[PDB]
């Protein structure tokens, strides 16, 4: 939470599951320990990803 990073994670477009149990802990460690994240993509997709991260 003090070590600085600006790491970039891609997010593909599966059916209704929206992440991977292959890649879930690695992409949640960054959102838990980060301070400012940004989202580039489709409108409702980045909306539901903000909702999913803030709600999870």
């Amino acid at each position: 939470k003090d070590t600085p990073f600006m790491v970039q994670v891609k997010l593909p477009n599966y059916k209704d599951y929206l992440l991977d149990n292959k890649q879930v802990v690695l992409t949640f460690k960054l959102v838990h320990h980060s301070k400012k994240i940004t989202l580039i993509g489709d409108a409702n997709k980045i909306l539901q990803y903000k909702n999913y991260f803030q709600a999870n």
Partner: protein, 31 residues
């Protein structure tokens, strides 16, 4: 009796390290 090697007594955050470094192989002995 056998002990259970009790305490090192100093604490820290764990920090399984995030930022990765390239790990060159240091098997450069004499040649």
């Amino acid at each position: 009796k056998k002990v259970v090697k009790q305490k090192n007594h100093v604490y820290t955050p764990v920090y399984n390290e995030l930022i990765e470094k390239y790990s060159e192989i240091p098997l450069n002995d004499k040649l």
